[PDB]
């Protein structure tokens, strides 16, 4: 089963709601709870790091860094959580909302399935990684948001700046539906 942990972001309902419509069993867990709660289930298949204001205010962020054993897909602040964890940096670029984010021929052929090479997708340039850590590689880069998606090779870790949870997210539900499905698979 998939586990969804929130780090301050109230946009987690989109994670559990989407998975449901996709046919993937998952449960949401608050940050107030102890890390042992999520660390006690090492059998899980995948994890989703809901958005949030800052992952530097919660102590659970440390658990996500050591829980890399499983495929964790971070959103909004998620991608930023992996950076500070590896020793990177993050800042603000464009707080604007109404903006375009086209992505050229780039994909890990894993979660970006059912997606073409050149397509226009929605994404806010609020905050994105400003540092370039070692061991991580971008799977999808946009003409404006090159850090649209970052995955580590050393371990099964994934991160994204855009919010694929929302419906308006063009070509976003694909990465959220493809991933949640890859790890969503359960046994009876």
UniProtKB/Swiss-Prot annotation:
UniProt GO MF annotations: ATP binding; GMP synthase (glutamine-hydrolyzing) activity
Pathway(s) per entry: Purine metabolism; GMP biosynthesis; GMP from XMP (L-Gln route): step 1/1
Signal peptide feature range: none
Entries under Pfam families matching the protein: GATase
Domain Glutamine amidotransferase type-1: 1-188
E.C. number: 6.3.5.2
Enzyme class: ligase
Keywords: ATP-binding, Glutamine amidotransferase, GMP biosynthesis, Ligase, Nucleotide-binding, Purine biosynthesis
SS bond partners: none
Lineage top rank: taxon: Archaea
Catalytic activity: XMP + L-glutamine + ATP + H2O = GMP + L-glutamate + AMP + diphosphate + 2 H(+)
Catalytic-site annotation from UniProt: 76, 163, 165
Protein function: Catalyzes the synthesis of GMP from XMP.
Subunit structure: Heterodimer composed of a glutamine amidotransferase subunit (A) and a GMP-binding subunit (B).
PANTHER family per record: GMP SYNTHASE [GLUTAMINE-HYDROLYZING], GMP SYNTHASE-RELATED
Name of the molecule in the record: GMP synthase [glutamine-hydrolyzing] subunit A
Organism expressing this protein natively: Methanocaldococcus jannaschii (strain ATCC 43067 / DSM 2661 / JAL-1 / JCM 10045 / NBRC 100440) (Methanococcus jannaschii)
Gene name in the database record: guaAA
């Amino acid at each position: 089963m998939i586990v969804i942990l929130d780090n301050g972001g109230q946009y987690v309902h989109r994670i559990h709601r989407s998975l449901k419509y996709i046919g993937v069993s998952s449960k949401i867990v608050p940050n107030t709870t102890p890390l042992e709660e999520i660390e006690s289930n090492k059998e899980v298949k995948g994890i989703i790091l809901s958005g949030g204001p800052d992952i530097e205010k919660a102590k659970n962020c440390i658990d996500i860094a050591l829980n890399a054993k499983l495929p964790i897909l971070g959103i909004c602040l998620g991608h930023q959580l992996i950076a500070l964890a590896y020793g990177g940096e993050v800042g603000r670029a464009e707080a604007e909302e109404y903006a375009l984010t086209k992505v050229y021929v780039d994909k890990e052929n894993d979660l970006f399935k059912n997606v073409p090479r050149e397509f226009n997708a929605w994404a806010s340039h609020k905050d994105e990684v400003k540092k370039v850590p070692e061991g991580f590689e971008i799977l999808a880069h946009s003409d404006i948001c090159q850090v649209e998606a970052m995955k580590h090779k050393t371990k099964p870790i994934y991160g994204v700046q855009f919010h694929p949870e929302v419906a308006h997210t063009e070509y976003g539900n694909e990465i959220l539906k493809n991933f949640c499905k890859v790890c969503g698979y359960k046994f009876e």
